[PDB]
């Protein structure tokens, strides 16, 4: 008898992000790096990775909830799917760079 | 009697980017910074600024050339315009940070 | 009961890239090289290899998802397939160069 | 009374490339750099810049000569124009980096 | 349930090139040569050999995929086959020269 | 009253090549280089440049003389023109490298 949506919202975005493992490691690497010494090339990758994770999450959720809000949008969905897919691919590349602990 | 498009393409994107002044300063700041000493907080801003400049340029050009490619896209144009405008606003904020030569 | 697409997008591009083995080695070679000494001719090959991997991935995904978006595109598909195939062939050549640990 | 096409071909591509000024400077910078000392970050930019100049030139010429070879290609032309424009924009960014004589 | 084409493209060109053994040896010879001493006459042969391998691979793949793209091309196929065959023959001659470890 | 074709053939190819200025300089550079000292990176460019000049000359002359030998070849002409144009563009790039007297 608890018809709230706070729990609904948190689970909805959490399942739409699913970056907990990705971000969690990103926190350790960006924490260990500066702690050990001054290494510039890795923090940049972390900064970009999280930024793109936000952008893709922003785009994915909106069209995931609905696709008939506008009078007609049938082919443009692929373009947004195309754009989001490219962002994920970039995220994959950078995530591979950082886990190597080097450029 | 030179019906090429190389000149057309370069001018088209150059007028669609118009970041020459923005980027040019970004090059000097990212060059002077590391030259003087190890300062981490500024290079990150430069990295993000150029990244967003690319993203907005990518989005702007496609819909600028045409808007009737899909069967119907009349209200979604605002959403893309909304997204691009937000990116520019972020670019403005970071550009203001870096020109201050501090966090 | 999790109708998300984040997992869908990541798997889609990951299976469309399948460069994890290729890139992973690229990270080690580009890390060991500068670590040992200054060797210019190998890093360039790594830089080009990943660049082309991105370009081919960009082209492959778009037409893989659909091929009837435009009013009619039946013969142009081969041209894009021709272009992507050439990029892969170039990627093969450079990948062979770098694994030789020499020019 | 010289109905050859060698002169036609050379002028056609030369006007389609128009990188003589761009490349010519690229030669001096990539020559002075290694001559002075070992500086890695600049040669990579030169290598990428020329590579993209080739790719865009490859794409531009084919569709510039004709656009009705296939049964119908009216909307895909924009996609190729979109792809080529992005490559030029990348070329602009790197060209700006290298002329700064720094990262 | 993985309807991708990255794997398709890589295998397609790899079976269309089948130079892995040829190139692999080319890497060792071009690596050992300069390592031992300054010997000019062999590297040139390696450079030409790989160049022709690219050219023939470029020509072979396009017409291998299809031969009815144009309104009619029945006799010209032999000319392209003639041209590609000559390139392979040249590749054979140079490959024989280099394996002799001499001019 | 001299209905020979030796003079016709020599002029025909000479006007179809028009590399006398290009080759003539190529001879001096490839002569001065080894004379001064052992410099590997320039002779390779000369070797490739002349090779491509031959290939383009081979292709250009055949289709220049006639284009109706086969039952029908109307669209394939562009492909050959496309291939030859690319070779010239490569020749331009290398010719620019060598005239710089450096890599």
């Amino acid at each position: 008898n608890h018809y709230a949506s706070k729990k609904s919202a948190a689970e909805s975005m959490l399942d739409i992000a699913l970056l907990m493992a990705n971000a969690s490691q990103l926190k350790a690497v960006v924490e260990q790096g500066p702690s050990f010494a001054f290494y510039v090339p890795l923090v940049v990758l972390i900064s970009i990775s999280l930024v793109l994770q936000i952008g893709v999450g922003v785009l994915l959720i909106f069209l995931v909830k609905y696709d008939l809000n506008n009078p007609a949008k049938h082919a443009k969905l692929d373009f947004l799917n195309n754009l989001a897919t490219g962002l994920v691919f970039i995220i994959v590349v950078v995530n591979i760079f950082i886990t190597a602990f080097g450029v």
Side-chain angles (χ1 to χ4, degrees), chain A:
Chain A
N1 298 330
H2 301 264
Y3 303 89
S5 178
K6 171 66 192 314
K7 305 171 283 292
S8 179
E11 296 295 350
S12 178
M13 289 298 284
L14 184 56
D15 184 71
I16 288 287
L18 294 167
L19 60 91
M20 191 68 173
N22 302 337
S24 300
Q25 181 62 260
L26 267 59
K27 315 310 176 159
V29 299
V30 70
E31 177 176 0
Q32 295 179 350
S35 305
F36 171 85
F38 285 57
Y39 289 151
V40 302
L42 286 97
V43 64
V44 182
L45 305 174
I46 307 301
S47 299
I48 300 169
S49 176
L50 51 95
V51 168
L52 305 186
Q53 284 179 328
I54 296 170
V56 64
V58 168
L59 300 180
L60 182 63
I61 185 70
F62 163 76
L63 55 81
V64 156
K65 289 189 178 300
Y66 269 95
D67 54 327
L68 281 63
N69 188 334
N70 306 29
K73 49 185 184 181
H74 193 271
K76 208 154 174 183
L77 180 69
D78 299 359
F79 181 91
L80 279 293
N81 298 16
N82 170 31
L83 193 69
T85 50
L87 267 63
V88 178
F89 181 65
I90 299 286
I91 292 166
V92 174
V93 176
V94 298
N95 169 86
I96 299 154
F97 265 124
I98 59 101
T99 182
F101 216 104
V103 187

